[PDB]
Design a protein around this ligand. Structure first.
Ligand SMILES: FC(F)(F)c1nnc2ccc(NCCc3c[nH]c4ccccc34)nn12
Ligand SMILES: [Cl-]
Length: 123
């Protein structure tokens, strides 16, 4: 396993915005409770899950546990940065797997719910 993505970086400029607060309170916390959220709540453990090629393929890993901790730690500058992390998470699942795989069906459902929630954001 490589080290997981950082959740703190003292030199990085940070900001609290209404949209980032909404991404944590509403978007993250709703997706987190979905029946399909569990594979995505922590970094992929390639040793535990016996996926020795996972990080041979996936070079920008991302997961909702990392996103949650970034949001709680005030890591982001803006909502778009956080949205990009969600998109990286979904894309990684699609890249490492194949259409029709159970885990891909899970990511597809979560991505549709994610887009539904970010379609309208607070001002
Ligand atoms: F680690 C991640 F994020 F779960 C993840 N991303 N791509 C993948 C590809 C395979 C995988 N095997 C872990 C156990 C498992 C076997 N069949 C499943 C069907 C749905 C969910 C988990 C599984 N886990 N995996
Ligand atoms: Cl601020």
């Amino acid at each position: 396993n490589p080290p997981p993505p950082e959740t703190s970086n003292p030199n990085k400029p940070k900001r609290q915005t209404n949209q980032l607060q909404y991404l944590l309170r509403v978007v993250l916390k709703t997706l987190w409770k979905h029946q399909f959220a569990w594979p995505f709540q922590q970094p992929v453990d390639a040793v535990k899950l016996n996926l020795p090629d996972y990080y041979k393929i996936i070079k920008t890993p991302m997961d909702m546990g990392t996103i949650k901790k970034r949001l709680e730690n005030n890591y982001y500058w803006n909502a778009q940065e956080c949205i990009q992390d969600f998109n990286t998470m979904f894309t990684n699942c699609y890249i490492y797997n194949k259409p029709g795989d159970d885990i891909v069906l899970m990511a597809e459902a979560l991505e549709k719910l994610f887009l539904q929630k970010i379609n309208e954001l607070p001002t």
